[PDB]
């Protein structure tokens, strides 16, 4: 493997928190990034008591990430696959997941880091970054299936990136992934047709993107508060959607509404979102984005 890292190069420092299939650690990795003798990293592991399905999914997720190179997607740095346990080493996102980050910015949050909530400009920047990462994933012919603030990560410089590919599926041959039946599923983020027909497409990721905008503007309130999981399933299939957060900027409300068109064919594409926002972004954006890259063809 070009991805293999010697185990002795990794040192675990502390627990970051439970991942999909086991604990994630903050660690040091020696000689993993050219130009750095030692780099602080995130290291994902599988739980000792993980089911066979979970063990398979953990390895599949690492494999998927090997194919990705995008500034707005969290980078896989290496795998320790010699001996045991398997360590999956990724780019450390200094400000954690976006759901946790947004919740910390609430005026009354105990962990308010002493910084103001996102400005409109900052919310637009976040939106464009998330949409750019998603545009990349779509161009690579994957559907994410779990787009949500908790699965976006925030870097040292506050750049947002797509993380957590635990539900991501290849759609190269057909442009959709179908899985009917019972599951432990992110019901509050799922599109009506996913709920009804078990179908997942870039359009259903777009529905979730709308919910991410709602999270950003509500500082990650719980969607459909007061509704149970089963009530949400009914409500959304029947044409229900979320109300606008208090003081939600109108530019963002307009976008959410478009993401929540009942007919998936009427929703925007991720490329359309970046394009809508392209003139309201940091000067570095065209230097790093998938949208502005030669790859976007």
């Amino acid at each position: 493997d070009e991805w293999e890292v010697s185990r002795e190069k990794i040192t675990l420092l502390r627990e970051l928190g439970q991942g999909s299939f086991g604990m994630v650690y903050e660690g040091n990795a020696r000689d993993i990034i050219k130009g750095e003798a030692e780099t602080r990293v995130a290291v994902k592991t599988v739980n000792e008591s993980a089911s066979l399905r979970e063990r398979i999914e953990f390895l599949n997720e690492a494999s998927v990430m090997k194919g990705f190179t995008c500034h707005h997607v969290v980078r896989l740095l290496g795998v320790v696959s010699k001996g045991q346990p398997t360590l999956v080493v990724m780019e450390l996102m200094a400000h954690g997941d976006l759901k946790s980050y947004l919740r910390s910015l609430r005026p009354e949050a105990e962990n308010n880091p002493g910084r103001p909530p996102p400005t409109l400009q900052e919310m637009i920047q976040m939106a464009a970054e998330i949409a750019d990462g998603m545009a990349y994933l779509n161009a690579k012919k994957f559907v994410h299936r779990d787009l949500a603030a908790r699965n976006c990560m925030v870097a040292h410089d506050f750049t947002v990136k797509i993380g957590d590919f635990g539900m991501t599926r290849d759609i190269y041959e057909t442009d959709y992934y179908r899985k009917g039946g019972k599951g432990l599923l992110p019901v509050r983020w799922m599109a009506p047709e996913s709920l009804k027909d078990g179908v997942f497409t870039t359009s259903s990721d777009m529905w979730s993107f709308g919910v991410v905008l709602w999270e950003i503007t509500s500082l990650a309130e719980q969607p459909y508060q007061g509704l149970s999981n089963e009530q949400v399933l009914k409500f959304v299939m029947d044409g229900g959607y979320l109300d606008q957060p208090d003081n939600c900027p109108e530019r963002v409300t307009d976008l959410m509404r478009m993401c929540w068109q009942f007919n998936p064919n009427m929703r925007p594409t991720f490329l359309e979102i970046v394009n809508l926002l392209k003139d309201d972004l940091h000067p570095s954006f065209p230097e790093v984005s998938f949208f502005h890259s030669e790859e976007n063809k």
């Binding site: 928190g17 994630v24 908790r150 039946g181 019972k182 709920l195 009804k196 999981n229």
Partner: peptide
């Protein structure tokens, strides 16, 4: 890297 287990529910789709 917080888990939000409550963000998932056992439901049937399809």
């Amino acid at each position: 890297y917080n888990p939000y287990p409550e963000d998932y529910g056992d439901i049937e789709i399809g």
